[PDB]
Amino acid sequence: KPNYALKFTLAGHTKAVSSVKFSPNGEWLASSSADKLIKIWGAYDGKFEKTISGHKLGISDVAWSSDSNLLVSASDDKTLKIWDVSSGKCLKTLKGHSNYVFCCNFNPQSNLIVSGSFDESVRIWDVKTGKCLKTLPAHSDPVSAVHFNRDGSLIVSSSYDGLCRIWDTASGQCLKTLIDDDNPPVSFVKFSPNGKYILAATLDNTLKLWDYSKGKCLKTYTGHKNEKYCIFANFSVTGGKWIVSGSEDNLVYIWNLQTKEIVQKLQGHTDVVISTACHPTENIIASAALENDKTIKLWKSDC
């Protein structure tokens, strides 16, 4: 079992925090909030570094470029913005969604950004021009998550319509659709590190690990509370192989990936833990909570 213990609490956002993400080079933690701001913090000591602003409404997601120099954010103002972290400047504003932009991510090459919106589409944007390359009629309800696989050739998207679909990046055509015996809202999805599996959250208090090639569920994780918010889930790989997720009972849950047994529950936040992230090299977890809390916590484990 790991032994995560709270090391720092980061305060500064004025409304609920929406997401937290460690930079690939591991020196920074970035946070997005409904306060329309993005904040950068030192990953190991929680040191407040800077505030990046410009969006006109709340932000639901922020993601790093592979070289840790850029960020892309998704906002209710219907745009995504690409930022240069060092200067804090907005390099491009991506316009084209007709409603809130919910999720975003850079491909490994970092030449593309994929986005998901309440407008039910998935868009692929050219980073250098800031122009939309493709618009995919991906789903029939809001799009909760979008993520590229390891070589960037695939994109996985999820939606409240209960589906998780995999798309061919170059053509934008759908390669496969995954559906359980039922279709509760799919609130989050992402490929595993090697791109072979897909971790999916559904609003019935359940996380599932799917085999992409076989389209079958390999593991199911339960015990937490998740029926209302789109809560992120992560693969923790620096030490023991865990599955990490926030929960509506204000705790961070950690499961053993293979056994599916819960190995630790982190107590401390005073509101729904909406987002968690795992450090790329150290056994460190960042967690963020909603309105009654609005803080970010950094936890560290020996294993």
């Binding site: 929406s18 409904a34 409404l57 809001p142 918010y229």
Partner: peptide, 6 residues
């Protein structure tokens, strides 16, 4: 945003 229930 993600911070509100939809």
């Amino acid at each position: 945003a993600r911070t509100k229930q939809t």
